[PDB]
Write a protein that binds this ligand. Structure first.
Ligand code: FP7
Length: 129
């Protein structure tokens, strides 16, 4: 079995920006989630080879994880905060699609998504450079 290449965290041609909102995503939102006791399964791409999940990447065609998001924010990969928010949403969605509702990993993801949504209500209202 093989894993796919992970999602890119840098791209030489993609315009880069640091916005007030992107800075709040790094300094607050991701800080809270990264350090939470439920974060660790989500800190790196799903390793389908080590987990013995040969169907994972047959079912999940848009992978995403918090390690990728952290590297994207540190590399100033994004133009806007909505791209980052979309990545968190993808990560949660993937967990809910692959696993059975009420598996422990799903309940953990639900708890992190609830926390995520709480924190992103405190984003600066207007995105500015
Ligand atoms: C929340 C905690 O109880 C727990 C449960 C299960 C695992 C096992 N596991 C699962 C994954 C995984 C992800 C992130 N998405 O689909 C799966 C199957 C990854 C690593 C891992 O050890 C960990 C913690």
């Amino acid at each position: 079995s093989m894993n796919p290449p992970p999602p890119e965290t840098s791209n030489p041609n993609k315009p880069k920006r640091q916005t007030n909102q992107l800075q709040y995503l790094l300094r607050v939102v991701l800080k809270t989630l990264w350090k939470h006791q439920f974060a660790w399964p989500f800190q790196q791409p799903v390793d389908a080879v080590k987990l013995n999940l040969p169907d994972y990447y047959k079912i999940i065609k848009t992978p995403m994880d918090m390690g990728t998001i952290k590297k994207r924010l540190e590399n100033n990969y994004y133009w806007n905060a909505q791209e980052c928010i979309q990545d968190f949403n993808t990560m949660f969605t993937n967990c809910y699609i692959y696993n059975k509702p009420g598996d422990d990993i799903v309940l953990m993801a639900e708890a992190l998504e609830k926390l995520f949504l709480q924190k992103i209500n405190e984003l600066p209202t207007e995105e500015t450079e």
